[PDB]
Design an enzyme around this catalytic site. Structure first.
Site, PDB file in Angstrom:
ATOM      1  N   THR A   1     -44.013  28.401  -7.746  1.00  0.00           N
ATOM      2  CA  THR A   1     -43.437  29.550  -8.467  1.00  0.00           C
ATOM      3  C   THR A   1     -42.718  28.955  -9.654  1.00  0.00           C
ATOM      4  OG1 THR A   1     -43.279  30.852  -6.515  1.00  0.00           O
ATOM      5  CG2 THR A   1     -41.779  31.407  -8.328  1.00  0.00           C
TER       6      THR A   1
ATOM      7  N   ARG B   1     -36.799  40.500 -10.520  1.00  0.00           N
ATOM      8  CA  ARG B   1     -35.606  39.857  -9.959  1.00  0.00           C
ATOM      9  C   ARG B   1     -35.145  38.629 -10.780  1.00  0.00           C
ATOM     10  NH1 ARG B   1     -35.059  41.006  -4.487  1.00  0.00           N
ATOM     11  NH2 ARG B   1     -34.512  38.909  -3.694  1.00  0.00           N
TER      12      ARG B   1
ATOM     13  N   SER C   1     -42.696  31.369   2.290  1.00  0.00           N
ATOM     14  CA  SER C   1     -41.683  30.957   1.312  1.00  0.00           C
ATOM     15  C   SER C   1     -41.107  29.602   1.606  1.00  0.00           C
ATOM     16  CB  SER C   1     -40.525  31.957   1.297  1.00  0.00           C
ATOM     17  OG  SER C   1     -39.364  31.464   0.612  1.00  0.00           O
TER      18      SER C   1
ATOM     19  N   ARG D   1     -28.530  39.192 -10.381  1.00  0.00           N
ATOM     20  CA  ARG D   1     -28.649  40.447  -9.642  1.00  0.00           C
ATOM     21  C   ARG D   1     -27.236  40.950  -9.406  1.00  0.00           C
ATOM     22  NH1 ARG D   1     -32.837  37.301  -5.872  1.00  0.00           N
ATOM     23  NH2 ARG D   1     -34.183  36.477  -7.597  1.00  0.00           N
TER      24      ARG D   1
ATOM     25  N   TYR E   1     -40.590  25.030  -3.480  1.00  0.00           N
ATOM     26  CA  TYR E   1     -39.776  24.754  -4.648  1.00  0.00           C
ATOM     27  C   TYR E   1     -39.563  23.238  -4.580  1.00  0.00           C
ATOM     28  CZ  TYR E   1     -38.656  29.587  -5.856  1.00  0.00           C
ATOM     29  OH  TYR E   1     -38.726  30.914  -6.223  1.00  0.00           O
TER      30      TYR E   1
ATOM     31  N   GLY F   1     -44.687  41.880  -1.870  1.00  0.00           N
ATOM     32  CA  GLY F   1     -43.395  41.261  -1.666  1.00  0.00           C
ATOM     33  C   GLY F   1     -42.539  42.132  -0.750  1.00  0.00           C
TER      34      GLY F   1
ATOM     35  N   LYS G   1     -47.517  30.656  -9.694  1.00  0.00           N
ATOM     36  CA  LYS G   1     -47.053  32.046  -9.579  1.00  0.00           C
ATOM     37  C   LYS G   1     -45.967  32.328 -10.602  1.00  0.00           C
ATOM     38  CE  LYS G   1     -44.794  35.115  -6.139  1.00  0.00           C
ATOM     39  NZ  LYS G   1     -43.332  34.999  -6.448  1.00  0.00           N
TER      40      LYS G   1
ATOM     41  N   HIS H   1     -41.897  38.237 -10.635  1.00  0.00           N
ATOM     42  CA  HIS H   1     -40.951  38.048  -9.525  1.00  0.00           C
ATOM     43  C   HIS H   1     -40.279  39.371  -9.150  1.00  0.00           C
ATOM     44  CE1 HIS H   1     -39.041  34.311  -7.572  1.00  0.00           C
ATOM     45  NE2 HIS H   1     -38.331  35.283  -7.024  1.00  0.00           N
TER      46      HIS H   1
ATOM     47  N   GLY I   1     -46.275  42.708  -7.729  1.00  0.00           N
ATOM     48  CA  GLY I   1     -45.280  43.470  -8.457  1.00  0.00           C
ATOM     49  C   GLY I   1     -45.552  44.944  -8.531  1.00  0.00           C
ATOM     50  N   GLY I   2     -44.924  45.707  -7.630  1.00  0.00           N
ATOM     51  CA  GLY I   2     -45.074  47.157  -7.695  1.00  0.00           C
ATOM     52  C   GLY I   2     -46.264  47.756  -7.001  1.00  0.00           C
TER      53      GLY I   2
HETATM   54  C1  LIG Z   1     -36.152  39.391  -0.637  1.00  0.00           C
HETATM   55  C2  LIG Z   1     -37.099  38.696  -1.607  1.00  0.00           C
HETATM   56  C3  LIG Z   1     -37.184  37.307  -1.554  1.00  0.00           C
HETATM   57  C4  LIG Z   1     -38.078  36.643  -2.403  1.00  0.00           C
HETATM   58  N1  LIG Z   1     -38.210  35.266  -2.249  1.00  0.00           N
HETATM   59  C5  LIG Z   1     -39.165  34.630  -3.044  1.00  0.00           C
HETATM   60  C6  LIG Z   1     -39.352  33.275  -2.764  1.00  0.00           C
HETATM   61  O1  LIG Z   1     -38.791  32.564  -1.924  1.00  0.00           O
HETATM   62  N2  LIG Z   1     -40.340  32.695  -3.538  1.00  0.00           N
HETATM   63  C7  LIG Z   1     -41.126  33.317  -4.540  1.00  0.00           C
HETATM   64  O2  LIG Z   1     -41.995  32.765  -5.163  1.00  0.00           O
HETATM   65  N3  LIG Z   1     -40.845  34.641  -4.724  1.00  0.00           N
HETATM   66  C8  LIG Z   1     -39.932  35.325  -4.020  1.00  0.00           C
HETATM   67  N4  LIG Z   1     -39.780  36.676  -4.202  1.00  0.00           N
HETATM   68  C9  LIG Z   1     -40.600  37.329  -5.166  1.00  0.00           C
HETATM   69  C10 LIG Z   1     -41.869  37.968  -4.458  1.00  0.00           C
HETATM   70  O3  LIG Z   1     -42.803  36.907  -4.150  1.00  0.00           O
HETATM   71  C11 LIG Z   1     -42.635  38.975  -5.290  1.00  0.00           C
HETATM   72  O4  LIG Z   1     -42.990  38.283  -6.581  1.00  0.00           O
HETATM   73  C12 LIG Z   1     -41.886  40.149  -5.701  1.00  0.00           C
HETATM   74  O5  LIG Z   1     -41.129  40.722  -4.590  1.00  0.00           O
HETATM   75  C13 LIG Z   1     -42.704  41.246  -6.406  1.00  0.00           C
HETATM   76  O6  LIG Z   1     -43.579  41.963  -5.436  1.00  0.00           O
HETATM   77  P1  LIG Z   1     -43.126  43.398  -4.860  1.00  0.00           P
HETATM   78  O7  LIG Z   1     -43.035  44.359  -6.012  1.00  0.00           O
HETATM   79  O8  LIG Z   1     -44.246  43.723  -3.965  1.00  0.00           O
HETATM   80  O9  LIG Z   1     -41.797  43.278  -4.165  1.00  0.00           O
HETATM   81  C14 LIG Z   1     -38.865  37.375  -3.370  1.00  0.00           C
HETATM   82  C15 LIG Z   1     -38.752  38.783  -3.411  1.00  0.00           C
HETATM   83  C16 LIG Z   1     -37.890  39.422  -2.528  1.00  0.00           C
HETATM   84  C17 LIG Z   1     -37.862  40.930  -2.576  1.00  0.00           C
HETATM   85  C1  LIG Z   2     -30.795  28.208  -1.912  1.00  0.00           C
HETATM   86  C2  LIG Z   2     -31.452  29.746  -2.233  1.00  0.00           C
HETATM   87  C3  LIG Z   2     -30.932  30.574  -3.248  1.00  0.00           C
HETATM   88  C4  LIG Z   2     -31.532  31.838  -3.475  1.00  0.00           C
HETATM   89  C5  LIG Z   2     -32.637  32.246  -2.692  1.00  0.00           C
HETATM   90  S1  LIG Z   2     -33.420  33.828  -2.938  1.00  0.00           S
HETATM   91  C6  LIG Z   2     -35.070  33.375  -3.608  1.00  0.00           C
HETATM   92  S2  LIG Z   2     -35.456  31.753  -3.941  1.00  0.00           S
HETATM   93  N1  LIG Z   2     -36.745  32.220  -4.913  1.00  0.00           N
HETATM   94  N2  LIG Z   2     -36.775  33.568  -5.124  1.00  0.00           N
HETATM   95  C7  LIG Z   2     -35.711  34.218  -4.393  1.00  0.00           C
HETATM   96  C8  LIG Z   2     -35.532  35.636  -4.588  1.00  0.00           C
HETATM   97  O1  LIG Z   2     -34.641  36.171  -3.945  1.00  0.00           O
HETATM   98  O2  LIG Z   2     -36.271  36.242  -5.386  1.00  0.00           O
HETATM   99  C9  LIG Z   2     -33.125  31.400  -1.684  1.00  0.00           C
HETATM  100  C10 LIG Z   2     -32.530  30.142  -1.452  1.00  0.00           C
END
Ligand SMILES: Cc1cc2nc3c(=O)[nH]c(=O)nc-3n(C[C@H](O)[C@H](O)[C@H](O)COP(=O)(O)O)c2cc1C
Ligand SMILES: Cc1ccc(Sc2snnc2C(=O)O)cc1
Ligand SMILES: Cc1cc2nc3c(=O)[nH]c(=O)nc-3n(C[C@H](O)[C@H](O)[C@H](O)COP(=O)(O)O)c2cc1C
Ligand SMILES: Cc1cc2nc3c(=O)[nH]c(=O)nc-3n(C[C@H](O)[C@H](O)[C@H](O)COP(=O)(O)O)c2cc1C
Ligand SMILES: Cc1cc2nc3c(=O)[nH]c(=O)nc-3n(C[C@H](O)[C@H](O)[C@H](O)COP(=O)(O)O)c2cc1C
Ligand SMILES: Cc1ccc(Sc2snnc2C(=O)O)cc1
Ligand SMILES: Cc1ccc(Sc2snnc2C(=O)O)cc1
Ligand SMILES: Cc1ccc(Sc2snnc2C(=O)O)cc1
Lengths: 336, 336, 336, 336
Positions: free
Chosen positions: C155, C235, C105, C164, C129, C286, C208, C232, C264-265
């Site tokens: 992404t 979320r 990430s 959330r 990002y 994830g 993504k 995602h 996802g899932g």
């Molecule tokens: C705690 C958490 C943090 C995440 N952070 C990111 C992130 O930094 N970048 C990103 O592209 N997706 C992020 N995601 C999305 C995941 O890459 C993934 O798309 C998502 O969890 C769906 O898969 P899952 O059903 O297996 O959890 C995050 C998800 C979770 C649960």
């Molecule tokens: C500055 C910042 C703010 C929020 C996050 S949490 C993250 S970022 N991309 N996806 C997620 C997610 O939780 O799904 C991380 C850094």
């Protein structure tokens, strides 16, 4: 009192350890198919015909040319002593008195000789998991023939065992000695092996586990004598079709060439009625037989068979079917 | 206070023994149809027409040429004294005051003579289960005619009694003397018998229990005067269609030749409205009448009838229907 | 013991604070898509083919030309130290031992240098990002290339963070210092920026978050090298399609031109099997990786990967697929 | 803290008596439509478009040519003092600050003069239930015009009040003096009356409660200026279509000739987004405004409006819609 199969299920759980109950349930992975086998029966709708003379209703039929009291038989289930000390001997006595077919598992608690001795005149089939050593396979089928078994059931949906989460947790927690007091693994078996097996026995072969029209077509090309449509009670590959739903395409592929049976989720008389209306020649029971044993031994198995037969007789009476031959797709709403 | 039929259901359960309540519920086998009779009404969607003059809304209609205050009548239900001491006498008084049709069961707690005496001017039909002795059948229908009954209802979905699990458990546990203080079995009756019955009485015959277009067509060929579309409240063959769903095909087969009514799951005014929109001439109530008796005797039955009539008046007002003749399929979403 | 991914989910919740667990769940708004990602997998039905030689089943495949042990990889998830002190270092060690792809990430708890040092030979992609300052963007992608990352994941479904509710309640209640001990906001990024990014790096770009055929067509016109179909994890924008359902239209639009993956899932082997049958080249995990870390650190991630790989091997064996290339739409009921 | 509309619903219930809460809920009969208004929004699936410049997203729009900050307005709801002492004065102040349209009910706790005085510059419409005395009707509409109201809303789905069971139980139990401290009945109003009303006022007429294409066509033939698609929150005729579903046929009938709005079940930003994508020009809120008042008075209403506007801004950003004009059926899965 225990007046239906569901009562036997509830009482059996009270009479067994958590480990034994979890084995008898045994749903694989997320347990989707275990539940759908029941739900798929419940959503089918019946179309009864009234004002017919139902003074005499006959539930008898024949499978592989042998008459049975009702189209309700016993599917192969391992280890009956987990439920009742006398195990398969109790099951055999009940099956003979009920005059239905008892399919003995490849993993019975008692020897074939001791089971046959308990009820010499019973109608029985034998389900055998084949091994790599064909000397053993030949001896076993010859042994079964000598003992009066009338067909061999080959279960094809268990090249490896399903992933049953509760069993796995229980196993990692307890020593095998307690788990089994109070591994398999046949993935190589294929159509090649079936043809060889057919060449070494005069007994008819019934394939159990077929869910698709493609495998039904292959079964007919290999000249087997019957097919049990089954998903192994949702204990093997999960998220496959309910067996009562898979029955439709198998029956459509077979077009009456060989007998088609089914198991999976049969718990009440209308479930039996629906399977017969959709083309099955008879149904087989898995877990209900073990629930009957766990509750009352031989008498419990006999009561399960008698109750389901009485329920079938009742719904045939209510729906207007005087005999099994009169149960047809006309009874089923849009489907048929 | 009790402001809707559901309140009467809840209060009735508190006022009855477990055995009596289980008998009034009485779902057969897995109880699928008992629940679907309600769910099938709830999923139908209404299309109201607004800005019409609804200052006067009339709920009156006629059945078999006799005017009634609303298309809400009493289906035959056995043993009213299980709910209230005065039993059918209380029901008859309420039905006469409400000016609707009361169908008296073949198994009433009081004699036809005593019921008629309680409300001499009430509009009543008689549901009679026929016996093997036609001397008795003839005497009973002549008796009913003498007493002023205006039609005979023949229930055709009970050649044997349904399998109601709770009742069966209660029965095996208790002596008949307590179960009935504080068997049947007509499977031979057929179309042959219906024609004979029609030849011995001048009373119109209404068949109750028809669920299929095939039996509706046979009913018309036998020249009966009406049909009640019914699955016996899910107390007989289970897993059949909800009665409000079966109504559609029966109405389509009949095409207005004879009056079609229904029972099963009617609990609120829009359920009555939907049955009328789909072609029924009136609905009949089974369990709600017993709930009314169990709660308050005659006054309870009258309140159930009054409440449902007020709900029908309200939804006719809201939906734009000034009279029963204005309730049509246009009110029903894609279906119609 | 923990024998499936669901066990890791349950145990992880016990081992984390409410705030950290709510962040790992993180469903947006009413939480419709979080639940549907699972339900959409469960409703798909499998069609197994039996009596095939499954003595040897191979789960290996390749993504972007690189061999991996199973089509099960790690999706980018921020802040692994929320789950385990060693964070991404633990994840990297487990991913290298399992021989799958780890997508790091853009918001990792440890620097890219420290993560690579923990497992120098691991196969990794980097999700970045982008910021407004292209000097920073250029430096970061050059840094990633220097460190051996093999692809850049962009992404595209997070121009702003999803809403959330639990996180928001927790945040308004607690000081940032406790919430983060023990903001974003990129909405301007567009196709214009993607082309510029592609011009400054030799690394393949994987997009993504694509859910529609229209965005898949634009992705192909911009010559990206892969697409991860993803919502995602429910979320971000809620009430969008489940990712396993969106996969079908993306695969149909792409027609094999570039590799399509999904997340996802995915929780059990048949979910992986279904995604592969519907056209995905591999799936990404994830939350399960975070559950593995929360329970047992590196060993927990390795166990999650090993368990899901064993489940995939088992359902390929049961369904008749000897290798990943044999998993096709024929396995899927009416869909396919 | 209260971070979404659902939090206001939960907290409002804690802050009100059972009688007042039951009135604010007020579902009619079995409560089918109250629940379906929400479920019908949740089942619609969104199709987001990513990689667009969403740096600036604008939620403004116009209704009847007047600009408002977001397409989120206040539906007419009686008796605001049941929720907060200052009642409609608090609502008016919040609506003016938010710059949206406030529709004042015909049964407000405060006089129109006192409400206008609280926020002289607010954009307001007036919902008036007409009486038999046209002298009174004329005076009321002239009064509303004098006070600066910009449109008259005529609610057409309440010729009689719906049957709300909880309210009825509460009423039969308590004296009117406590129930209303701390009857109607217009069924004659018809299209004839609408034309007369239009002839006596220069104010545009908006009809509220239309659910069918037939009534929408009549509304256009009578030259009204707008229609609010609504089922009165499931408080009137129950078992009608959800309002978001009825919107589709009304929009299809109207074909852009006049503005179409809706209320019923709008609780989150994507619900607003979906109504706009399906053709509504704006949505109106009923119960959420009362929840805002019950929790925090003026500030509560303002927070509800601000939260829903922020959620709409967020989902427009995520889905790729820069302004309200860019929200189209392309966002909706098979429907559109
Ligand atoms: C705690 C958490 C943090 C995440 N952070 C990111 C992130 O930094 N970048 C990103 O592209 N997706 C992020 N995601 C999305 C995941 O890459 C993934 O798309 C998502 O969890 C769906 O898969 P899952 O059903 O297996 O959890 C995050 C998800 C979770 C649960
Ligand atoms: C500055 C910042 C703010 C929020 C996050 S949490 C993250 S970022 N991309 N996806 C997620 C997610 O939780 O799904 C991380 C850094
Ligand atoms: C405890 C148990 C053991 C089983 N053992 C076997 C077995 O040895 N051989 C076989 O072909 N099927 C076996 N099965 C599967 C059953 O034959 C049957 O397919 C399955 O239970 C579905 O029927 P049911 O829904 O009536 O339980 C077993 C099932 C259970 C519950
Ligand atoms: C306690 C009870 C007794 C019944 N007895 C009869 C009976 O004697 N004859 C008959 O035709 N139906 C009988 N029925 C069936 C009812 O006439 C009716 O079909 C059924 O209750 C469905 O209507 P409901 O949903 O309003 O209860 C009985 C039902 C109940 C609940
Ligand atoms: C307490 C309450 C009072 C209401 N009073 C009126 C009223 O006076 N006039 C009217 O047209 N609608 C009235 N309604 C209906 C609302 O305008 C609105 O149609 C309904 O609440 C559906 O929107 P919702 O789901 O956002 O609550 C009332 C609703 C509630 C909850
Ligand atoms: C060595 C061995 C391993 C496992 C079993 S249990 C059995 S075998 N075929 N089906 C089942 C089932 O439980 O469904 C029996 C013997
Ligand atoms: C002898 C006898 C046996 C059973 C009953 S109960 C009855 S009869 N027709 N329908 C029902 C029903 O309960 O639905 C009445 C008399
Ligand atoms: C006299 C009187 C009687 C009842 C009410 S409540 C109202 S009026 N229009 N809609 C509602 C509703 O609650 O939905 C107000 C005044």
């Amino acid at each position: 009192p225990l007046v239906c199969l569901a009562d036997f299920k509830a009482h059996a759980q009270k009479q067994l350890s958590k480990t034994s109950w979890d084995f008898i349930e045994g749903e694989a992975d997320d347990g989707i198919t275990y539940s759908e086998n029941i739900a798929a029966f419940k959503r089918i709708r019946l179309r009864p015909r009234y004002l017919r003379d139902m003074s005499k209703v006959d539930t008898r039929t024949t499978i592989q040319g042998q008459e049975i009291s009702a189209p309700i038989c016993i599917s192969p289930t391992a280890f009956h002593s987990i439920a009742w000390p006398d195990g398969e001997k109790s099951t055999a006595r009940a099956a003979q008195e009920a005059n239905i077919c008892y399919v003995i598992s490849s993993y019975a608690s008692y020897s074939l000789e001791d089971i046959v001795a308990a009820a010499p005149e019973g109608f029985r089939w034998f389900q055998l998991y084949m091994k790599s050593d064909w000397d053993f396979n030949k001896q076993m089928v010859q042994r079964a023939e000598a003992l009066g078994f009338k067909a061999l059931v080959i279960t094809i949906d268990t090249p490896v065992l399903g992933n049953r989460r509760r069993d796995k947790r229980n196993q990692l927690n307890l020593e095998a000695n307690i788990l089994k007091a109070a591994l398999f693994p046949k993935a190589s078996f294929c159509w090649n092996d079936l043809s060889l097996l057919q060449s070494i026995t005069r007994l008819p072969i019934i394939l159990k586990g077929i869910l698709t029209k493609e495998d039904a077509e292959l079964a007919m090309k290999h000249n087997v004598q019957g097919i049990v449509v089954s998903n192994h009670g949702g204990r093997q590959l999960d998220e496959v079709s309910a067996s009562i739903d898979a029955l439709r395409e198998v029956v459509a592929a077979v077009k009456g060439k060989i007998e088609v049976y089914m198991d999976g989720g049969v718990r009440t008389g209308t479930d039996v009625l629906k399977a017969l209306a959709l083309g099955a020649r008879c149904i087989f029971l898995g877990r209900p037989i073990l629930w009957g044993l766990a509750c009352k031994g031989e008498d419990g198995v006999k009561e399960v068979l008698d109750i389901l037969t009485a329920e079938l007789h009742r719904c045939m009476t209510l729906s207007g079917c005087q005999s099994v031959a009169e149960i047809s797709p006309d009874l089923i709403q849009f489907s048929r």
